[PDB]
UniProtKB/Swiss-Prot annotation, chains A, B:
The gene is CCL3. The chain holds residues 24 to 91 of 92 of the full protein. Disulfide bonds join 10-34, 11-50. The record marks 17, 45, 47 as: Involved in GAG binding. It comes from the Eukaryota. Changing residue 66 to A: Reduces self-association. This is C-C motif chemokine 3.
């Protein structure tokens, strides 16, 4: 099940404060074509939050999502 | 009326063939932070189409949208 082609989402700035984990609904990695490495978190209320893939809390949140 | 911050849409490739103009519903210019200059057209069926801002048919479609 492939996705219809579409503009690419990119992160040009990261959130400076960690999101409460109970807000997190999903995540996905941004394209490498983008200027900066990126993790976009999706909240329960469908807010998009750009995050630094190198930060530990980001890596933790991603891991918790993947292993459940 | 400002917009909630969000991942930035970017175009990393342009459509190679011109869209039928009666398909076009709206347009917007992509951020300059993006790698490439971009016009994203939005079709009646909400398809997103990346287009080269330098091409004449793109400039024409944008003009027709702006002046109506």
């Amino acid at each position: 099940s492939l996705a219809a082609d579409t503009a690419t989402a990119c992160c040009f700035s990261y959130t400076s404060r960690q999101i409460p984990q109970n807000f997190i609904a999903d995540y996905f990695e941004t394209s490498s074509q983008c200027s900066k490495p990126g993790v976009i978190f999706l909240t329960k209320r469908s807010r998009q939050v750009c995050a630094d893939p190198s930060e530990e809390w980001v890596q933790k949140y991603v891991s918790d999502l993947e292993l459940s």
